[PDB]
Design an enzyme around this catalytic site. Structure first.
Site, PDB file in Angstrom:
ATOM      1  N   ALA A 249       1.114  -0.867  -0.292  1.00 51.14           N
ATOM      2  CA  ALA A 249       0.311   0.163   0.051  1.00 51.14           C
ATOM      3  C   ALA A 249       0.564   1.535   0.004  1.00 51.14           C
ATOM      4  O   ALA A 249       0.309   2.449   0.147  1.00 51.14           O
ATOM      5  CB  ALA A 249      -1.229   0.195   0.910  1.00 51.14           C
ATOM      6  N   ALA A 250       2.386   1.356  -0.231  1.00 54.79           N
ATOM      7  CA  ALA A 250       3.102   2.591   0.157  1.00 54.79           C
ATOM      8  C   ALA A 250       2.558   3.292  -1.294  1.00 54.79           C
ATOM      9  O   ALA A 250       2.157   3.947  -1.223  1.00 54.79           O
ATOM     10  CB  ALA A 250       4.721   1.693  -0.584  1.00 54.79           C
ATOM     11  N   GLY A 251       2.752   2.754  -3.198  1.00 52.68           N
ATOM     12  CA  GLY A 251       2.256   3.324  -3.666  1.00 52.68           C
ATOM     13  C   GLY A 251       0.694   3.306  -4.001  1.00 52.68           C
ATOM     14  O   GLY A 251       0.296   4.579  -4.613  1.00 52.68           O
ATOM     15  N   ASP A 252       0.370   2.488  -3.631  1.00 54.56           N
ATOM     16  CA  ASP A 252      -1.650   3.350  -3.402  1.00 54.56           C
ATOM     17  C   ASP A 252      -2.147   4.580  -2.999  1.00 54.56           C
ATOM     18  O   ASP A 252      -2.695   5.262  -2.687  1.00 54.56           O
ATOM     19  CB  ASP A 252      -2.013   2.204  -2.652  1.00 54.56           C
ATOM     20  CG  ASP A 252      -2.298   0.394  -3.630  1.00 54.56           C
ATOM     21  OD1 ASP A 252      -2.278   0.411  -4.438  1.00 54.56           O
ATOM     22  OD2 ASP A 252      -2.744  -0.662  -2.862  1.00 54.56           O
TER      23      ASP A 252
HETATM   24  O1  LIG Z   1      -1.657  -2.515  -3.512  1.00 51.82           O
HETATM   25  C1  LIG Z   1      -2.000  -3.183  -2.816  1.00 51.82           C
HETATM   26  C2  LIG Z   1      -3.364  -4.171  -2.693  1.00 51.82           C
HETATM   27  O2  LIG Z   1      -2.535  -4.319  -4.023  1.00 51.82           O
HETATM   28  C3  LIG Z   1      -3.056  -6.173  -3.909  1.00 51.82           C
HETATM   29  O3  LIG Z   1      -4.635  -5.529  -4.708  1.00 51.82           O
HETATM   30  C4  LIG Z   1      -3.740  -6.330  -2.641  1.00 51.82           C
HETATM   31  O4  LIG Z   1      -5.154  -6.611  -2.213  1.00 51.82           O
HETATM   32  C5  LIG Z   1      -3.374  -5.172  -1.907  1.00 51.82           C
HETATM   33  O5  LIG Z   1      -3.939  -4.874  -0.747  1.00 51.82           O
END
Ligand SMILES: OC[C@H]1O[C@H](O)[C@H](O)[C@@H]1O
Ligand SMILES: OC[C@H]1O[C@H](O)[C@H](O)[C@@H]1O
Lengths: 305, 305
Positions: A249-252
Site C-alpha cells: 500500500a505504499a504506491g496506493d
Molecule cells: O496494492 C496493494 C494491494 O494490491 C493487491 O490488490 C492487494 O489486495 C493489496 O492490498
C-alpha cells in the site's frame, strides 16, 4: 478542493509474515498472519479519504460477511460509499500475500466480485463522474469498465488519473484518455517497451506516454523517488529515506494522497512531496489499509521535515 | 491390520491457481481460488483412512468455524477424531498456497492452534499410542510434542514413522526413536548434510540415517520414485508416470497409504507400490485433501497396471 471519484478493487487481504519467500515445492512456516481489507481501489480510496479529499468510491463487494462489513469500515475513512455495490451470490475479491523479513511482498489476487464492476454499473455513475474534478483508477477492475469511466471523464473534463497496476499492456484508446499516469518501472516497461533503470530510461519511457496523449507522467523509481514529466520537461523528486517494514500500500497511499493535494490546488512538485510523506508513514507500519495515515499525521511529518 | 495413530497438523488451505508464481514486489492475477481443509497431519490422516487403515488422529483445531467443522469432515473419512482437541480462544492453523500453471506450488503456513498440541496433550494419549502398531507424524506440530510421542511409541514397540516435512534439522534424540523416515531430497540434505541428486547420493544420505538408528529409510526422488533402504541394502522403486495437475498432498497421500499397506502386512516393496498408486491418483486432482483416493480406486488403479 473539488470532488474525487475513485473506481477500483476491494479485496480481503490474507497476509503472512515470513523470513523468506517460499521457493517452488517448499513449505515455509511464517509468523504473523492477518486478514485485513485491501485492494488497490480500497487502499487509494482510504489514502485519499484519510488525507483530506472529498471522495466517493465506485466498487463492487460480494455478499459474504467480509464484503458486507468492508463498506461500513470504508465509510469511517471519510469515503462516500454509496456507489460501492454489493453483488449477490458472489464473494469479495481476495488477495494472498507473503511479506518477507526484508519487508518485500509477493501478491496473488482473485477477482471475485471485483469482476462484476461493469460498464453498466459505470454508466449508472455517469453524472457522478461528469461532476467530479478527478477520477482515480487502477487495473484490478475490468479493463472495459476502466475504459468506459475514462471515456465519460474525458468528455466532461474530469481529470483521469491512472495507476497502471498491476502491470499489463493497455490499448491506445485507453492511454489517449489519461491525464496523469503513475506506473512503476515494470509497468512503464510493459506500457512502452523501455526498461527503466535510470532517469534517462525514465525520460525515454515518459516520452512514449507523452506520445500516447498523456500530459503528466510520474514514473516511480522505487527508493529513488519519482520521475515527474509534464509533457516533456521532467525531473526526479526523491522520497523520504525511511525505515521500511511493510511496503504494501505504499504506491496506493502515494496515489491517493497525490490526488488529494492536486485537488487542493497544490502545484505538482508539492503534491508529490505530500504524497511521498503519506507513503513514508505508510511503510513504517504493517498491512495495506491499516498503515494509511490521516491528514494531521502527514502535516506533522512534513512540519518536522 | 493393527491400529494407526496419526499425530500432526490441521490447516485451512487458501489456494490460488495462477500462471506463474509472483516475483518480489509483483502482483499477479490468478484464476481459481479455493478454501479447503489441509495440513500435513490431516492429509496423511485422510489418505490413511480412505485407503483402509484403522486410524485415530491426535491434532488440535481452533474454535473458529473452520476448526469446528473440520472434525466433522474428518470423521467421514474413516478417522476416529476423538483425540482431535478444540482449543478455545484460538484459530485453526492456516496455509496460503500458490499453484502455478505447471502445477508446482509454494506454501506458507501459520501454526494457529497446531502450536497448542503439546507434550501434555500427547501424554494424555499415552495408552492410545502404546496400544497402536504405528505412529505417523510430520513436522507441522511442535518438535517437543513429536519427541514426546516418539518416546512413548519407542517404549511400547509402536512403529514410529516420520515424514520430516517441512525440512528442518532434527536432534539425534528424535532420530534415534524413528523406525521409518520418509524425507524428500531437500529434507534428506537438511538432516544429513548430503545433497541428493541421484541414487548414490541417496544411498549416501540413507547411510547417515541408518547411522542415527533408523532402520527403514525412504528418500523420495521427485519424478524418479523412491530410494528404499532397509538398514543398508537399498534400491529405487519408481512411481507411476502420470499427468500432474495438482501435486499438493502427493507426499502426504503416499505417507498415509504407505502406512496402511504396512499395517496390512504387505512387504515394503508392495507397500510402496500401493502408496505410489494413491499418490498417482491424488496428483491428477486438485487441492490437498479433496484429491485423496478411497481404497476401491487404489485397487482399480493397481488392477489396470
Ligand atoms: O496494492 C496493494 C494491494 O494490491 C493487491 O490488490 C492487494 O489486495 C493489496 O492490498
Ligand atoms: O503437505 C501439504 C500440506 O502442507 C501444508 O501443511 C498445507 O496446509 C498443505 O495441505
Amino acid at each position: 478542493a473539488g470532488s474525487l471519484v475513485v473506481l477500483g478493487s476491494i479485496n480481503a487481504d490474507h497476509i503472512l509474515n515470513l523470513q523468506s519467500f517460499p521457493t517452488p515445492g517448499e513449505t515455509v512456516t511464517g509468523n504473523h498472519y492477518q486478514v485485513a481489507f485491501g485492494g488497490k481501489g480500497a487502499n487509494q480510496a482510504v489514502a485519499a479519504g484519510r488525507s483530506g479529499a472529498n471522495i466517493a468510491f465506485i466498487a463492487c463487494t460480494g455478499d459474504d460477511s467480509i464484503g458486507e462489513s468492508v463498506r461500513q469500515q470504508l465509510a469511517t475513512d471519510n469515503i462516500d460509499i454509496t456507489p460501492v455495490s454489493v453483488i449477490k451470490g458472489e464473494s469479495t475479491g481476495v488477495a494472498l500475500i507473503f511479506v518477507n523479513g526484508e519487508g518485500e511482498n509477493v501478491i496473488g489476487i482473485h477477482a471475485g466480485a471485483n469482476a462484476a464492476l461493469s460498464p453498466a454499473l459505470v454508466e449508472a455513475q455517469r453524472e457522478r463522474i461528469a461532476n467530479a474534478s478527478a477520477l482515480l483508477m487502477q487495473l484490478e477492475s475490468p479493463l472495459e469498465s476502466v475504459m468506459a469511466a475514462a471515456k465519460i471523464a474525458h468528455q466532461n473534463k474530469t481529470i483521469v488519473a491512472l495507476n497502471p497496476a498491476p502491470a499489463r499492456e493497455l490499448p491506445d484508446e485507453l492511454l489517449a484518455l489519461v491525464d496523469i499516469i503513475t506506473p512503476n518501472e515494470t509497468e512503464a516497461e510493459k506500457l512502452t517497451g523501455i526498461r527503466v533503470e535510470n532517469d534517462e530510461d525514465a525520460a525515454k519511457a515518459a516520452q512514449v506516454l507523452h506520445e500516447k496523449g498523456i500530459r503528466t507522467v510520474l514514473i516511480t523509481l522505487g527508493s529513488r523517488g519519482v520521475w515527474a514529466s509534464v509533457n516533456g520537461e521532467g525531473q526526479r523528486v526523491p522520497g523520504f529515506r525511511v525505515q521500511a517494514v511493510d511496503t504494501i500500500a505504499a504506491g496506493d497511499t502515494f496515489n491517493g494522497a497525490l490526488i488529494t493535494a492536486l485537488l487542493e490546488e497544490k502545484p505538482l512538485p508539492e503534491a508529490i512531496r505530500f504524497a511521498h510523506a503519506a507513503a513514508a508513514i505508510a511503510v513504517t507500519r504493517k498491512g495495506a489499509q491499516p498503515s494509511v495515515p490521516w491528514r494531521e499525521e502527514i502535516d506533522a511529518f512534513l512540519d518536522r521535515q
